[PDB]
Design an enzyme around this catalytic site. Sequence first.
Site, short mmCIF file in Angstrom:
data_model
loop_
_atom_site.label_atom_id
_atom_site.label_comp_id
_atom_site.label_asym_id
_atom_site.label_seq_id
_atom_site.Cartn_x
_atom_site.Cartn_y
_atom_site.Cartn_z
CB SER B 217 -0.97 -0.12 1.09
OG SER B 217 -1.53 1.18 1.30
NE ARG B 218 3.22 0.99 -5.40
CZ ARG B 218 3.82 0.80 -6.76
NH1 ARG B 218 4.42 1.80 -7.20
NH2 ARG B 218 3.56 -0.44 -7.32
CB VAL B 219 -1.57 5.67 1.35
CG1 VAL B 219 -2.05 4.48 2.13
CG2 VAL B 219 -2.00 6.99 1.52
#
Lengths: 210, 281, 70, 177, 365, 52, 52, 52, 277
Positions: B217-219
């Site tokens: 999850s690149r958040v």
Amino acid sequence: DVFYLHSRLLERAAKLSKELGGGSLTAFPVIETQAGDVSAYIATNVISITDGQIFLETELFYKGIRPALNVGLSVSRVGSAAQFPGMKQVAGTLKLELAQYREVAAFAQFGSDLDAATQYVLERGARLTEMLKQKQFAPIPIERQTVAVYAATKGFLDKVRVQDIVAAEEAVISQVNPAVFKILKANGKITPALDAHLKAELRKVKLPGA
Amino acid sequence: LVPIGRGQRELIIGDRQTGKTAVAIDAIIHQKNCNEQVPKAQRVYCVYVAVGQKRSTVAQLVKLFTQTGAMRYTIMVSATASDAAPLQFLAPYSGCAMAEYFRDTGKHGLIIYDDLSKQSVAYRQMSLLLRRPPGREAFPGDVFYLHSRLLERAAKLSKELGGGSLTAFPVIETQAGDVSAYIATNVISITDGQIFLETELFYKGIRPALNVGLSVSRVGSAAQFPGMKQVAGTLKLELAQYREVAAFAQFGSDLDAATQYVLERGARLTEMLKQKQFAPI
Amino acid sequence: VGLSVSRVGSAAQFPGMKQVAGTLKLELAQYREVAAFAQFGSDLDAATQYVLERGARLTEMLKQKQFAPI
Amino acid sequence: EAAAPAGPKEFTEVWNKKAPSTLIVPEFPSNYTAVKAVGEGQVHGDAFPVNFYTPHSILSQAQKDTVVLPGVDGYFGVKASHVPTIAQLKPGVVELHSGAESEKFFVSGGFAFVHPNGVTDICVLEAATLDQVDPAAVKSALAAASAAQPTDEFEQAANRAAIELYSALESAVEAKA
Amino acid sequence: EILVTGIKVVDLLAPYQRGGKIGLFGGAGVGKTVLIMELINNVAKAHGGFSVFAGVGERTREGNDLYREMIESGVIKLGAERGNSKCTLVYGQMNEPPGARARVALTGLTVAEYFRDIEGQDVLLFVDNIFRFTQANSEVSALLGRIPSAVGYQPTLATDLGGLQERITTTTKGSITSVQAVYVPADDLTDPAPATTFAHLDATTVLSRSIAELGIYPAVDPLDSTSRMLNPNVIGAEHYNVARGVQKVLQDYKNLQDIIAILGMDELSEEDKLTVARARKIQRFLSQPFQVAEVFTGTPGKYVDLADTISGFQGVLTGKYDDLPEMAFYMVGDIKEVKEKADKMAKDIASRKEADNKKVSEELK
Amino acid sequence: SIAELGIYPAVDPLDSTSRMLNPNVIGAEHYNVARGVQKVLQDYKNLQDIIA
Amino acid sequence: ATDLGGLQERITTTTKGSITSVQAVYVPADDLTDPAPATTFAHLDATTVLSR
Amino acid sequence: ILGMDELSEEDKLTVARARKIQRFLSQPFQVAEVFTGTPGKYVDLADTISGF
Amino acid sequence: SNQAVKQRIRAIKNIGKITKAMKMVAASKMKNAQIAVEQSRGLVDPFVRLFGDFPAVNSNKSVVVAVTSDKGLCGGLNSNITKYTRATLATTESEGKDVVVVSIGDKGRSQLTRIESQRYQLAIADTYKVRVTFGQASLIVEELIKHNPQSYQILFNKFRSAISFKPTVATILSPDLLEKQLEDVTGNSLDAYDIEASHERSDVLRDLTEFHLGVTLYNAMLENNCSEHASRMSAMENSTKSAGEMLGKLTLDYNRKRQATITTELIEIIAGASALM
Ligand SMILES: Nc1ncnc2c1ncn2[C@@H]1O[C@H](COP(=O)(O)OP(=O)(O)OP(=O)(O)O)[C@@H](O)[C@H]1O
Ligand SMILES: Nc1ncnc2c1ncn2[C@@H]1O[C@H](COP(=O)(O)OP(=O)(O)O)[C@@H](O)[C@H]1O
Ligand SMILES: [Mg+2]
Ligand SMILES: [Mg+2]
């Protein structure tokens, strides 16, 4: 439409009704696989067209077993109601004992232990294999086949050494009275009056090696 | 493990019958359960886009959302398999435009494009019959642009434009775990995160069948609930140890007492994350 | 050295190199055969360990530095 | 007194009625030996079977006619139909004669049995023969064995064993032919 | 609502919906016609509604076999009492040109749609090789002047297949229980014609070739066949739990296949080699003799009730049957017949009789 | 493969090259450290088919 | 198959003489099921393997 | 892996017969006598069947 | 997908080298451990003809010993005598006796506590690391006589050949606690021997039983060590054979996928060219 290339062709091999003549056409399509890959495109096309399948193994062929029939894969769900009734009752025993021989030699190749009952069916199934070898361009009548299957699954060919059975099943057909095969061809069936007689004529057989 | 913020695009990629639509349905049902406990500036209105499914499956989902109560917040844009290929191609854009009303009025949206692979298949048909020259796996050249110009519309807006959000959950079905296929790599490249589910973890009893290594999850943990963040780095770290000291757990003979604690602790954590469906927590 | 072939080098190299390179390439033919076998160096035969040590000598012998041809 | 006939014949019974049938009855060390002790014969006249043993070697399986063993009550000699004797041996030399020739091993100490069928079993630990001992490091060791008297009885017993071994190894290294 | 089929692997691990679309996947001799005939023999005889067999691109021998076998069973009656028949056959078999095989499934679908819409009753539609519809469109579409899609198929594959399959539904006016066999080319499930069919089906039954080569028949892969009825709110709690436990044992055994192959069975842990034994038990126990296979096998067919399957597999899962051999489970009905076969095969190793019982030596006249 | 070990940045040490890895350019005592690191990691990659 | 067959079918024994062809066989990618050897091997009557 | 005297004496004879078969399959060639000196020998079929 | 098969091929091709290597290593260890075993076989014979062989004794206290392997790549050897030690502990235990279970080898402590946890009291391991000596076996014996039992049962695999390893149980009795009681045959069977000890018969029988326990423990863990090497040499030759067969099937399937890959990209290039031209 390479499926339609063969299904248009192999559906013309039929057994017609009595109202059309009762004539028949039996096909034998031949497929050459590459590395034993029966999951090729053309091979799986014709496997889903044809009724049976005669699978010839390349590792059985170099071990001398010829015709190298893969008995586990080789199927024919259309000839069952179409076998010789004398063979149907003696080779119902043949394919099941070859099944156990296929179960023993596929696990006990390590040389782990001899259970001395699975060790029995290993050199019984080795005798049924060598009984099923055949030379080339020498077909056998169906009556001289089902006696050689009778001579082996009924234990008359027991304790004959496995490198004698090619010479021993030639001893069986040569010494058994030729009137035996004439009753068996005409009845099409090993009658109760005949297996009592054919068990007798197999005891009077000069098997090689004793 | 894979925390999801308002405005990001999280791919749900997996094989067939592994839990993708289940995670999507749980995400919608939970927004129903959450909209009652939040004020009107915090509510999330869901949109479910069903491309290439049956009418029976869509009718089943509508029955489920009415029995739960999620249909007072949910739109369903269904281009089923009997519909024309231009309708299945245009249905994600239709659903995203119906969801962009909430992004553009300062509310919050949740758009779920179920079977975006099927939208790519409909676009391939529509472009092969228009005599446009095919490419890799007979797909058009602009099948990346097809998905990028759709998935880029999911955004968290600034406060001048209302502060609204649109959270997209595209769903891509793979073929025996092959995520190296064309549309799988394209949508992996587009979206922020990915929730990779496995058909081997699914039959180990691990449901939802989340591959905790490949799920990104690149958040980051910037969009995580606090407190869940206080336990999540620890849970990630012990699961990372439990994964790597495994592939030796077949030899249960030699008790090592340092690896074995890690193995049974990670077993506690892996059994913790199992979850029955249609009941979000 | 096992996959690189030269089908000319039979009687197309330096004769002082040909006196030695046959032995060098036959010693390395044993080292490539036993190398990935005996990665461990614990329980070893006194013939396999000798060709392992010889192959490890020749391997470090053949490597050279850049822009300095010999 | 004889109220428990144990044995491999009878262990088979209680095992077969109580162990699972996939396992055959386990073997026993008596199944691997051919020569017993009370049985008939194996003397035939003058030469009797002598079995010289260490844990790491077998030094004699051949038939000898007399054996000179160094017991703790002195060097005794075993002729053919010798009386059965479990003899503890001290450090000394074992002489296995057959005629003119004989094998003299200096041993370390350990028992030697003579059985009622004439089978003689010398069972020592270290049988260091006389032409491989050095005559120089024996005095270097028994010097410290003579000097060191500790406070504990354990190393006292070790030093007494040291001096009774080294002193006997003295007497059998100068007076050799 | 569930449809009990009598087949253990189907009723346990991928139960069929009564009114749902059922797919039998597998390629070229795995047994998806013997499975469809066992499903006919079990479901269609105890149904009450009408049946429609749509033979699309199959053997003409098989269609004649089904027609004669349905005449013998009274499902198809000839002549004056014909109207009491319970089946319509629509045959577009593999000798037909590709225009006929591409459209005979629609004809069989229309015959089923009339009974669903107008007569308003529950029908069964058995379509043998719905893949031949896709294949016949793929043969035609090379000559309709189109750019080809992936592997060589038509660009309109998914929509043709969808527009055909979306008519085979249960509606409010009637039911169609659809059992369609799906061929897979080259035993590849990633081929687009099976991979597109996967989405239109409620129950999937994937038959694999290696399981058939193990002798396990019906060769259903239990870790690749699924159902939407495998849900704890549909079939119950203990059924769903037993099914998930069987699938957990089988997956844990599938993860142990490499080290069992290359290191040997003798190097696993004890719980691992308990898992291996229970999995080899439940692999054999998922097999079953079919009543339509009793003419070429010799074993009588064994209809197993659903409660019998749940009870027997719960018995193997908890550990009540760690004592029996593996081959006690091979080709039996239920958990009574594994014990019957255990004493039948452990009286066989004690089966040695005296004097050969001749009474044949010189029988008098 | 560097990343699911948790190592960040997930730079492959045995695939990252530079033209600045001459001994003429960065000096010998840096180049020898880098070459020794790559040698050690490559031999560990060879030993991983035993020690796993 | 037709190009290879049109070559290799002219190498037969007639009534007047015979041609016997010794053909060096290269196997692409060490794959004996590749179509060039798998079509070439259908014509060969003997193989003479020269090993190192 | 075990040794030459590990196996039986009939295995010794199999080794000996096969080692003199491996040498008897060798042959001096008449075209190679220009650079190996020794004259080449055209062996008939009736001789090699009898010899083996 | 078509690259992971190329890495799986290299992995299996390397396993087929590692297992062939350690098959040769286990063969080299077996051929020189057999030398020590058939020399150690001699000294066990005078005790089993002097003290007999009584496995089924009425000991009220027993010490069973399961002599297992340290390295655990042996192939069903260690669990075989685990089955045998749970068969012999279900042969003597019928009268309410105390049993101590010890094991030699790390594969004994990991497979004996699974079948029996409370009677297991000692784990000897790291025995075969350097070599096996008699001082080591006698130290193990003294730590066994730290308990005071009336019998000792040794379980080990005896190296009959490189194929057969018959699991042998070996018994020793405590001297006048049980050895003098089991010899009383209307008198005694030991009175024929003339004791030439420095002290009485109980002391020479105590020393004899300690020496007998030492030599059967030394021979037991020599026989089991070289039968371990033989079962590893045979168990890594059924392993490299299966890893060659798996590699062959992987290479055939990789070649099928290679050919299908070249045809697939070629057909896509042809379709894209015919869509223009
Ligand atoms: N957490 C869970 N617990 C129990 N069952 C689950 C869970 N997640 C999924 N399932 C079951 O597994 C199956 C998964 O089907 P799902 O809804 O995922 O379809 P999909 O994979 O999205 O798409 P397709 O049907 O095309 O494969 C369903 O039957 C569902 O009921
Ligand atoms: N249920 C079954 N039990 C036993 N053998 C079977 C079964 N199904 C198939 N077979 C075997 O495999 C063959 C293929 O059966 P079939 O159902 O016609 O397969 P398909 O239609 O997929 O080619 C049969 O002829 C038989 O030999
Ligand atoms: Mg879905
Ligand atoms: Mg069929």
